[PDB]
Design a protein around this ligand. Sequence first.
Ligand SMILES: *[C@@H]1O[C@H](CO)[C@@H](O)[C@H](O)[C@H]1NC(C)=O
Lengths: 49, 50
Amino acid sequence: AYSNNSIAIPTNFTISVTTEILPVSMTKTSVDCTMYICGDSTECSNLLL
Amino acid sequence: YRVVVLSFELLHAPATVCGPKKSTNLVKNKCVNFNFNGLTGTGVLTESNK
Ligand SMILES: *[C@@H]1O[C@H](CO)[C@@H](O)[C@H](O)[C@H]1NC(C)=O
């Protein structure tokens, strides 16, 4: 409610604490390209190129 | 002309036949290509307890 004259003022307070999770880093995998695509094969180095 | 039509197995697994092929010492855990009755594979072969 309100009219030409009114206002609300707090009388007491209350300290509060709240968490805020935040990702920072992610475990980084090191995946190569040849083996995965092609293992040890004679034609591996010719058709790959 | 004898036109009798015959048909062998069409893409079936090994059976009671065994072609004229020799044998050699098996591979336990070597990271090499292997041959056991035609099937060929590469990579690393590791033994499990399944
Ligand atoms: C704290 O808040 C209560 C109501 O929750 C109030 O009665 C009290 O007056 C407040 N503290 C002080 C010092 O006034």
